[PDB]
Amino acid sequence: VESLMQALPGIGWTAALLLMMFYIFAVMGTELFGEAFPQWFGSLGASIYSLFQIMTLESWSMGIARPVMEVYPLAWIFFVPFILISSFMVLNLFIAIIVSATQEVHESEQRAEREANNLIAHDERQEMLDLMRAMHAKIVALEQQGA
Amino acid sequence: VESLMQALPGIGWTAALLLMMFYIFAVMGTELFGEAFPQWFGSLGASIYSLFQIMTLESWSMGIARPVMEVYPLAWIFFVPFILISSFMVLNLFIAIIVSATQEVHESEQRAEREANNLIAHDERQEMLDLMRAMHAKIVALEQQGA
Amino acid sequence: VESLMQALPGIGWTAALLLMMFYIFAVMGTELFGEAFPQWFGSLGASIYSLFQIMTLESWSMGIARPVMEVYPLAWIFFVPFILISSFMVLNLFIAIIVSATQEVHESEQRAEREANNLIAHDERQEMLDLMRAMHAKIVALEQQGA
Amino acid sequence: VESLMQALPGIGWTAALLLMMFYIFAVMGTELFGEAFPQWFGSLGASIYSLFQIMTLESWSMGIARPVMEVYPLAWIFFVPFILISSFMVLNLFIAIIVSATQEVHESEQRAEREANNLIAHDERQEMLDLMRAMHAKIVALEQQGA
Numbered sequence: 287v288e289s290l291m292q293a294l295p296g297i298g299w300t301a302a303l304l305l306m307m308f309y310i311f312a313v314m315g316t317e318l319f320g321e322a323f324p325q326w327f328g329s330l331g332a333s334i335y336s337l338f339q340i341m342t343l344e345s346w347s348m349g350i351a352r353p354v355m356e357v358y359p360l361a362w363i364f365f366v367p368f369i370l371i372s373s374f375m376v377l378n379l380f381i382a383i384i385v386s387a388t389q390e391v392h393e394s395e396q397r398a399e400r401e402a403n404n405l406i407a408h409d410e411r412q413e414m415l416d417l418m419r420a421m422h423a424k425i426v427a428l429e430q431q432g433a
Numbered sequence: 434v435e436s437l438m439q440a441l442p443g444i445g446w447t448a449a450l451l452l453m454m455f456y457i458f459a460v461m462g463t464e465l466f467g468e469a470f471p472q473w474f475g476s477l478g479a480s481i482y483s484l485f486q487i488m489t490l491e492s493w494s495m496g497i498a499r500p501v502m503e504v505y506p507l508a509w510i511f512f513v514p515f516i517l518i519s520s521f522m523v524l525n526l527f528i529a530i531i532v533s534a535t536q537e538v539h540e541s542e543q544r545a546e547r548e549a550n551n552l553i554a555h556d557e558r559q560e561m562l563d564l565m566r567a568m569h570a571k572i573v574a575l576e577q578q579g580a
Numbered sequence: 581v582e583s584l585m586q587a588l589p590g591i592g593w594t595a596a597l598l599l600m601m602f603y604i605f606a607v608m609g610t611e612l613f614g615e616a617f618p619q620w621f622g623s624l625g626a627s628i629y630s631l632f633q634i635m636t637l638e639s640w641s642m643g644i645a646r647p648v649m650e651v652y653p654l655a656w657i658f659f660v661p662f663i664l665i666s667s668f669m670v671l672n673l674f675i676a677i678i679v680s681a682t683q684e685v686h687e688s689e690q691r692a693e694r695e696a697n698n699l700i701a702h703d704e705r706q707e708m709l710d711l712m713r714a715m716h717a718k719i720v721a722l723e724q725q726g727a
Numbered sequence: 728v729e730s731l732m733q734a735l736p737g738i739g740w741t742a743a744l745l746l747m748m749f750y751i752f753a754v755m756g757t758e759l760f761g762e763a764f765p766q767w768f769g770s771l772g773a774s775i776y777s778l779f780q781i782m783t784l785e786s787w788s789m790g791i792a793r794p795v796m797e798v799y800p801l802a803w804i805f806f807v808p809f810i811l812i813s814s815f816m817v818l819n820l821f822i823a824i825i826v827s828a829t830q831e832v833h834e835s836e837q838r839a840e841r842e843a844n845n846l847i848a849h850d851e852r853q854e855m856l857d858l859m860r861a862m863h864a865k866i867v868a869l870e871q872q873g874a
Contacts, residue, residue, distance in 0.1 A: 295672040302597035303449035310456045378442040450743035525736040589819040596744035603751045
């Protein structure tokens, strides 16, 4: 549809800021956590991939977030904002698609309602004219009866 | 409501660029201030948390911003843009919610006006038809009197 | 036109996040690839220019992306998101211009419809008045015949 | 006005990405230019302030951009995108304010035009009723003349 196309620039804005959310937390994770957890945060590539695993729910079983929380108790100030902001972006990707569809339906229902009323207005006036003409004929008839 | 749903992608754009503002000023604060103030800016994690305290009005009493200003007189070129842009983003988070509500009310009031007028238009024309029919009948009555 | 003016702030948002996409992948490319490929990723300036060549379809013949893929088999986790997100932004630059034009046309057509109906409504009622007045006159004529 | 408030979240988006435009070119400028031009790009703080001078037109007389162009001939690939993208952001700050005002005027003119037509529609039908009633009275008068 050419109303989904309407919503694509905003989708890229969300998708763009989503990958930027990974990079800023990937750098952050490397400094905070890389020395104690080289396998998970020892580098930017290692951090970006550890963050990816957390978001794709391959971290319930081998839950990277939790052993880091053990060694560093305040580590939730890192993880909780990450999981929240990156879930909220993924949410907005679907919302933008949902809103695009429901907006197109809503606009279509409103043209339906205007021409629905514009039809009723047409028909009510047209049937008044029809009643006018028959009535004006009767007047002219009664007028010839006087002549 | 499913009109607050409509404003969420823009909320995330503001929320995303807000955390972006911390990271860019956290890096800048580390470079400018980390050597003279290692407890406050000696690292990216230290800088990000010093900036957080400033925005959460903790530094109303120990005031991190001001002793840095004292050693570095130009330091307001760092702090003033930070406090302004970060506050303006937090402001836009609430504005986006306020505008979402007031726009839903405004759209309701407009449908209320449009069927208010469409009702008056219907009633005024229906009343004319009623007047028509009683008149037409009287014409036909007087026409019978001539026959 | 002063409706393309309306779409410019969103154009800059796309253009801004596009150059953002280069920088974040330029840093990531340097870390991942700079040691094995110093001519292509040994620095941030080298990485930003290698990414530029890939997007401008220069690497259709010397194909920087592919020998990196050969040494690093996982390298598509870097290249594929890059080519997708950067192309999707460039796409949204043209969409924003297309949507701006088609929306100005759509709004024109709607004013054209609304005065099209407002004209028909005026003419149908004015024609009824004209019918009224000629009728009223004939009533008064026949009323004089009775006097 | 509470329609300027409507436009503020988009203003922050432009203002946000503007400061991000400085930081990414400030890092870029430091690596490309810092070794040969330590006074202008030797650090991130030095680069961010050299970029500021260029944009605030304190670089015609002491034109930092030009001696760098001399030593590095391809340096316009850095400066030209910088000056363009950061001018285009500042432009969009004023456009967002202009569009906010002209939109409020345009919406106000359209309510003026609807109640202008809704008044004409009211008055034309009301004067038809007035002509109805006088006419129906004449019919009843001529009907009593027959009785």
